[PDB]
């Protein structure tokens, strides 16, 4: 398994991040700041365990489609299922979202990952992209509410940069999935795991640092 | 698969509903009303994806019991797992339920569907109905709190009609399950899928319209 | 299956407990007390169904490792997944925890059980204990926040006794798991199920009585 290197590296970098975030957040008294620490640390924390699962090989399954027996890292969708709403919750709390928009974002987020999962396990190669289409659609709703649903200059300036980090990173995920072993098999799993590793550490630890250092 | 027609029809009607609900809820400023839009749209939204899963065939499994190899649409319990608490949350928010009754309803609701799931996958034909019995019991607790746990005339009148819609529809589900391919095999899967389709679109889009138009 | 006796006994004692708790909590008007009733009753309620699942045999799977085909009661982790955060939520609400510490405890709790699950299903005997190590680590964070994150004398005195009940009981779980069929196979499944049964009824009904009678 050639991509083991990017899984091992992902695991460690989610580890280093969880821990640094834990440290940095030793001391916080502020109820609000604690919240931002609870979320931000949990995210790579969970990401760590799941990257570990793929590295050790636990979160890895084969799906028969398109004549091949395709190895699919399911553990990603286990990761993403909890870490993605949490990321949205960082922005939501930041921007003082009404519970109405929180539920919407969280609800739409669950759909996104859920369809992504079903898509990933789909045995009929063509249906894979129907679920891709549904999932992407859900994605556009998030980016929608992020832009057009969502102010002290402190939160605003922090919001706009974290908002921007989200739009660009999350937009890359489907492309990878589409191009990768889940979709077209245009890029090998090796390159795909690398791209997903760059993205995840950027979308979590990267995103994380920007936040908790604000 | 003869019931494909009722799955296809279900899918479309959950689609038309999600979308109409999305539209209708373009504009809402009110924090409370947004909440009611978040929930009400999410419900058939999720229902859509799951009806799609059964139509495409993804949410369909065989369970060996009673000498046969029974096709069980598991995806229903995936649907119901999230859509049912949300329905209860519409009524709860409507009626200003204390968090105590919210947790109770949600908690009891999880049990209901969870036992329903286990029941559906049970390999010993007789145990199927033990889990049916547990699930139904949970159901009676919901209908209990709905009646005897739960006032501006606006919410009350809306509550009593939505409360009534719930009691009658949800009471039908076990009967179908008992009579259907999950339980007795008195009715064929075809008729059962139809009944479940009539119920779901009624319990979601039907229920939905009454609510958001109030 | 020799441990059937401890599963049957567990089932009944979670049953007797759910029901007594239901009764005892007929009448509560207080919003806060209701909360404490919602949680405390839900816990053995869920525990009941899951103990039933292992008794009937539904929540039982074989995992190939260390040359054997080890029967693993997975249903425990289904139980623990919801009942453990609820227990933490009893203490949290009791002690008026900020949402920051609630999320942290709940988040860390999910990790604990999740890794425990993965560990339990791990096919490489040695990795089992890596996940054991991760899970335990998560545990120490809970006991940490319980001691050093967490006052009318009423809640305090109740908190310190329930806090103590938690530390001692929950500390036993890994030891059992380590010694038992999940880990070392030092103790037979029979003895292990007994120990887990003593613990669960103590950590739930036992813990429960102390709380709702306060
Ligand atoms: C920490 C992990 C993050 C931020 C992951 C985000 C992943 C997505 C936004 C992926 C969404 C997907 C689609 C839009 C299409 C179908 C495939 C999914 C999972 C990749
Ligand atoms: C949108 C979907 C809804 C409102 C579904 C509701 C389903 C139930 C209330 C079903 C409960 C069940 C029992 C009471 C017994 C065992 C079988 C279950 C799932 C059908
Ligand atoms: C009602 C059930 C309760 C309170 C169960 C608590 C279980 C734990 C605290 C177990 C944690 C585990 C570890 C610390 C190591 C790996 C095995 C797990 C599940 C046993």
XYZ file of N, CA and C in Angstrom, chain B residues 30-175:
438
model
N -37.546 35.753 10.463
C -37.904 35.369 11.829
C -37.110 34.147 12.288
N -36.361 34.294 13.394
C -35.536 33.244 14.002
C -36.317 31.970 14.254
N -37.541 32.125 14.749
C -38.396 30.987 15.047
C -38.884 30.311 13.768
N -39.392 31.106 12.836
C -39.896 30.573 11.580
C -38.802 29.869 10.789
N -37.596 30.423 10.825
C -36.468 29.791 10.163
C -36.321 28.373 10.699
N -36.313 28.247 12.024
C -36.263 26.943 12.679
C -37.286 26.001 12.069
N -38.528 26.450 11.978
C -39.574 25.613 11.408
C -39.325 25.276 9.946
N -38.576 26.131 9.256
C -38.200 25.860 7.874
C -37.017 24.923 7.784
N -36.090 25.057 8.726
C -34.914 24.210 8.744
C -35.353 22.765 8.870
N -36.207 22.515 9.852
C -36.660 21.171 10.162
C -37.492 20.571 9.038
N -38.498 21.325 8.611
C -39.544 20.837 7.722
C -39.055 20.481 6.331
N -37.936 21.088 5.942
C -37.371 20.931 4.614
C -36.353 19.810 4.654
N -35.694 19.691 5.797
C -34.671 18.685 6.009
C -35.297 17.320 5.948
N -36.507 17.233 6.478
C -37.202 15.969 6.591
C -37.471 15.296 5.241
N -38.141 15.988 4.309
C -38.270 15.263 3.049
C -36.961 15.272 2.272
N -36.065 16.202 2.583
C -34.765 16.229 1.940
C -34.064 14.905 2.182
N -33.905 14.557 3.453
C -33.361 13.261 3.847
C -34.189 12.104 3.281
N -35.511 12.228 3.375
C -36.410 11.208 2.854
C -36.177 10.975 1.367
N -35.916 12.056 0.636
C -35.582 11.963 -0.788
C -34.395 11.034 -1.033
N -33.265 11.327 -0.388
C -32.045 10.561 -0.611
C -32.274 9.087 -0.309
N -33.030 8.810 0.746
C -33.216 7.438 1.173
C -34.163 6.688 0.256
N -35.228 7.354 -0.178
C -36.093 6.796 -1.219
C -35.332 6.536 -2.501
N -34.309 7.350 -2.743
C -33.474 7.181 -3.916
C -32.653 5.925 -3.722
N -32.150 5.744 -2.505
C -31.309 4.596 -2.192
C -32.030 3.270 -2.392
N -33.313 3.236 -2.054
C -34.118 2.027 -2.231
C -34.504 1.819 -3.686
N -34.780 2.919 -4.382
C -35.063 2.883 -5.815
C -33.876 2.380 -6.635
N -32.703 2.975 -6.429
C -31.492 2.520 -7.099
C -31.103 1.123 -6.613
N -31.522 0.789 -5.398
C -31.340 -0.546 -4.863
C -30.321 -0.620 -3.749
N -29.713 0.520 -3.428
C -28.633 0.559 -2.443
C -29.089 0.179 -1.014
N -30.257 0.663 -0.601
C -30.723 0.442 0.755
C -31.557 -0.807 0.930
N -31.178 -1.869 0.229
C -31.968 -3.085 0.171
C -31.118 -4.310 0.482
N -31.562 -5.092 1.460
C -30.805 -6.243 1.935
C -31.717 -7.437 2.127
N -31.126 -8.619 2.089
C -31.847 -9.850 2.306
C -31.550 -10.357 3.708
N -32.592 -10.814 4.397
C -32.472 -11.386 5.740
C -33.065 -12.783 5.737
N -32.286 -13.785 6.154
C -32.790 -15.160 6.160
C -33.665 -15.397 7.369
N -34.956 -15.647 7.173
C -35.827 -16.053 8.267
C -37.099 -16.692 7.740
N -37.674 -17.578 8.552
C -38.905 -18.267 8.218
C -38.789 -19.054 6.928
N -37.584 -19.541 6.641
C -37.353 -20.366 5.471
C -37.123 -19.624 4.174
N -37.372 -18.316 4.177
C -37.177 -17.499 2.982
C -35.933 -16.611 3.095
N -35.598 -15.911 2.010
C -34.516 -14.928 2.025
C -35.128 -13.566 1.757
N -35.623 -12.960 2.826
C -36.477 -11.785 2.747
C -35.749 -10.469 2.465
N -36.102 -9.802 1.349
C -35.594 -8.473 1.011
C -36.147 -7.446 1.985
N -35.248 -6.737 2.640
C -35.635 -5.771 3.642
C -35.035 -4.447 3.241
N -35.885 -3.450 3.090
C -35.403 -2.122 2.806
C -34.935 -1.495 4.105
N -33.644 -1.627 4.377
C -33.069 -1.091 5.604
C -33.049 0.432 5.599
N -32.988 1.024 4.402
C -32.786 2.461 4.250
C -33.866 3.272 4.937
N -35.034 2.654 5.110
C -36.146 3.265 5.816
C -35.750 3.694 7.209
N -35.004 2.832 7.886
C -34.654 3.061 9.277
C -33.566 4.099 9.386
N -32.848 4.300 8.278
C -31.860 5.375 8.140
C -32.569 6.710 7.955
N -33.571 6.702 7.079
C -34.514 7.790 6.897
C -35.116 8.176 8.245
N -35.857 7.230 8.820
C -36.672 7.437 10.010
C -35.860 7.858 11.222
N -34.605 7.412 11.279
C -33.702 7.721 12.389
C -33.513 9.221 12.623
N -33.449 9.982 11.535
C -33.310 11.437 11.599
C -34.622 12.193 11.337
N -35.463 11.696 10.438
C -36.668 12.446 10.101
C -37.696 12.391 11.228
N -37.766 11.270 11.934
C -38.744 11.176 13.014
C -38.460 12.093 14.216
N -37.193 12.211 14.653
C -37.000 13.169 15.747
C -37.300 14.594 15.295
N -37.019 14.888 14.033
C -37.231 16.226 13.501
C -38.726 16.572 13.510
N -39.563 15.625 13.098
C -41.010 15.813 13.154
C -41.450 16.141 14.580
N -41.007 15.327 15.538
C -41.231 15.588 16.967
C -40.688 16.937 17.439
N -39.628 17.404 16.787
C -39.006 18.659 17.171
C -39.829 19.847 16.673
N -40.549 19.652 15.565
C -41.495 20.642 15.027
C -42.626 20.908 16.000
N -43.170 19.824 16.532
C -44.241 19.898 17.506
C -43.719 20.453 18.815
N -42.543 19.987 19.223
C -41.949 20.410 20.483
C -41.694 21.908 20.497
N -41.036 22.406 19.458
C -40.738 23.831 19.368
C -42.027 24.622 19.307
N -42.995 24.068 18.589
C -44.285 24.687 18.398
C -44.931 24.904 19.738
N -44.890 23.857 20.549
C -45.592 23.825 21.818
C -44.709 24.282 22.985
N -43.496 24.741 22.662
C -42.550 25.258 23.656
C -42.204 24.216 24.727
N -41.868 23.005 24.292
C -41.573 21.919 25.210
C -40.312 22.201 26.003
N -40.299 21.791 27.264
C -39.089 21.891 28.055
C -38.088 20.899 27.505
N -36.806 21.151 27.745
C -35.761 20.294 27.213
C -35.948 18.882 27.747
N -36.548 18.786 28.927
C -36.864 17.509 29.528
C -37.755 16.651 28.664
N -38.817 17.236 28.110
C -39.721 16.485 27.233
C -39.134 16.299 25.838
N -38.301 17.237 25.393
C -37.631 17.099 24.104
C -36.734 15.877 24.089
N -35.837 15.809 25.060
C -34.949 14.668 25.222
C -35.724 13.350 25.333
N -36.797 13.363 26.121
C -37.662 12.198 26.293
C -38.258 11.708 24.973
N -38.882 12.622 24.245
C -39.429 12.321 22.936
C -38.337 11.856 21.977
N -37.217 12.574 21.932
C -36.131 12.225 21.025
C -35.531 10.896 21.430
N -35.240 10.763 22.720
C -34.730 9.532 23.279
C -35.625 8.339 23.017
N -36.925 8.490 23.268
C -37.892 7.419 23.016
C -38.012 7.140 21.526
N -37.818 8.185 20.730
C -37.939 8.052 19.295
C -36.788 7.230 18.753
N -35.591 7.465 19.274
C -34.429 6.706 18.869
C -34.606 5.233 19.163
N -35.152 4.937 20.333
C -35.433 3.564 20.739
C -36.406 2.887 19.776
N -37.519 3.564 19.513
C -38.522 3.101 18.553
C -37.910 2.620 17.225
N -37.177 3.508 16.559
C -36.573 3.199 15.272
C -35.460 2.154 15.410
N -34.639 2.288 16.450
C -33.541 1.369 16.695
C -33.975 -0.075 16.864
N -35.036 -0.277 17.633
C -35.593 -1.603 17.828
C -36.257 -2.093 16.550
N -36.917 -1.173 15.848
C -37.479 -1.440 14.538
C -36.437 -1.962 13.577
N -35.282 -1.307 13.557
C -34.156 -1.766 12.761
C -33.698 -3.163 13.158
N -33.415 -3.357 14.441
C -32.947 -4.650 14.902
C -33.981 -5.702 14.544
N -35.229 -5.427 14.888
C -36.322 -6.282 14.486
C -36.287 -6.651 13.014
N -36.077 -5.666 12.143
C -36.094 -5.899 10.707
C -34.992 -6.832 10.236
N -33.873 -6.838 10.950
C -32.701 -7.625 10.558
C -32.590 -8.947 11.328
N -33.493 -9.140 12.284
C -33.531 -10.336 13.110
C -33.640 -11.621 12.292
N -32.784 -12.595 12.575
C -32.749 -13.836 11.791
C -33.687 -14.930 12.349
N -34.116 -14.766 13.597
C -35.080 -15.671 14.224
C -36.482 -15.045 14.139
N -37.285 -15.548 13.203
C -38.612 -15.010 12.857
C -39.456 -14.533 14.041
N -39.386 -15.272 15.144
C -40.180 -14.987 16.338
C -39.691 -13.781 17.149
N -38.369 -13.639 17.281
C -37.765 -12.498 17.967
C -38.129 -11.185 17.272
N -38.392 -11.251 15.964
C -38.793 -10.081 15.168
C -39.912 -9.317 15.838
N -40.826 -10.058 16.446
C -42.014 -9.466 17.012
C -41.813 -9.036 18.452
N -40.770 -9.563 19.099
C -40.380 -9.080 20.415
C -39.886 -7.652 20.274
N -39.035 -7.434 19.274
C -38.531 -6.110 18.950
C -39.643 -5.211 18.398
N -40.580 -5.791 17.660
C -41.781 -5.069 17.276
C -42.518 -4.567 18.514
N -42.715 -5.457 19.482
C -43.375 -5.114 20.737
C -42.680 -3.988 21.507
N -41.358 -4.075 21.656
C -40.551 -3.002 22.254
C -40.703 -1.678 21.515
N -40.602 -1.735 20.196
C -40.687 -0.545 19.378
C -42.053 0.097 19.535
N -43.090 -0.718 19.476
C -44.436 -0.190 19.605
C -44.585 0.474 20.967
N -44.049 -0.175 21.998
C -44.129 0.351 23.351
C -43.563 1.764 23.368
N -42.393 1.942 22.753
C -41.755 3.248 22.648
C -42.690 4.232 21.977
N -43.332 3.775 20.908
C -44.310 4.580 20.189
C -45.399 5.128 21.096
N -45.943 4.275 21.955
C -47.037 4.679 22.825
C -46.598 5.753 23.809
N -45.301 5.816 24.078
C -44.767 6.843 24.961
C -44.779 8.176 24.247
N -44.495 8.160 22.952
C -44.504 9.391 22.168
C -45.907 9.966 22.122
N -46.858 9.127 21.711
C -48.271 9.483 21.622
C -48.784 9.917 22.989
N -48.241 9.300 24.040
C -48.510 9.698 25.422
C -48.088 11.140 25.715
N -46.820 11.455 25.484
C -46.302 12.784 25.772
C -46.953 13.814 24.856
N -47.131 13.439 23.596
C -47.876 14.247 22.636
C -49.264 14.648 23.133
N -49.995 13.699 23.719
C -51.326 13.974 24.268
C -51.258 14.590 25.671
N -50.557 13.913 26.580
C -50.602 14.231 28.014
C -49.354 14.918 28.585
N -48.410 15.300 27.732
C -47.305 16.136 28.171
C -47.585 17.528 27.658
N -48.035 17.562 26.409
C -48.413 18.788 25.725
C -49.880 19.131 25.974
N -50.561 28.687 25.880
C -51.016 28.208 24.584
C -51.820 29.272 23.851
N -51.145 30.079 23.031
C -51.845 30.977 22.118
C -52.686 30.120 21.188
N -53.899 30.581 20.869
C -54.800 29.740 20.076
C -54.166 29.367 18.742
N -53.241 30.204 18.270
C -52.563 29.992 16.990
C -51.757 28.710 16.986
N -50.903 28.565 17.988
C -50.090 27.376 18.097
C -50.956 26.177 18.481
N -51.941 26.400 19.351
C -52.760 25.317 19.887
C -53.520 24.618 18.780
N -54.244 25.415 18.002
C -55.043 24.916 16.892
C -54.151 24.216 15.873
N -52.954 24.764 15.666
C -51.990 24.172 14.744
C -51.422 22.926 15.376
N -51.182 22.994 16.676
C -50.683 21.837 17.389
C -51.659 20.666 17.333
N -52.931 20.918 17.629
C -53.909 19.830 17.715
C -54.135 19.105 16.385
N -54.009 19.833 15.278
C -54.183 19.227 13.964
C -52.934 18.450 13.556
N -51.765 19.001 13.857
C -50.523 18.306 13.568
C -50.347 17.151 14.553
N -50.830 17.331 15.773
C -50.781 16.254 16.748
C -51.628 15.105 16.241
N -52.792 15.433 15.691
C -53.716 14.413 15.217
C -53.197 13.684 13.987
N -52.527 14.428 13.114
C -51.937 13.871 11.907
C -50.885 12.853 12.284
N -50.142 13.164 13.339
C -49.095 12.279 13.837
C -49.650 10.974 14.397
N -50.635 11.072 15.282
C -51.177 9.896 15.950
C -51.686 8.891 14.936
N -52.398 9.385 13.931
C -53.054 8.511 12.971
C -52.091 7.882 11.978
N -51.162 8.686 11.481
C -50.183 8.186 10.531
C -49.212 7.231 11.186
N -48.596 7.664 12.283
C -47.567 6.857 12.930
C -48.132 5.536 13.445
N -49.426 5.516 13.784
C -50.093 4.309 14.272
C -50.216 3.274 13.175
N -50.074 3.709 11.929
C -50.289 2.822 10.801
C -49.038 2.049 10.484
N -47.896 2.686 10.718
C -46.585 2.095 10.441
C -46.376 0.679 11.005
N -46.630 0.474 12.312
C -46.456 -0.877 12.849
C -47.369 -1.889 12.178
N -48.626 -1.517 11.931
C -49.593 -2.405 11.295
C -49.068 -2.909 9.966
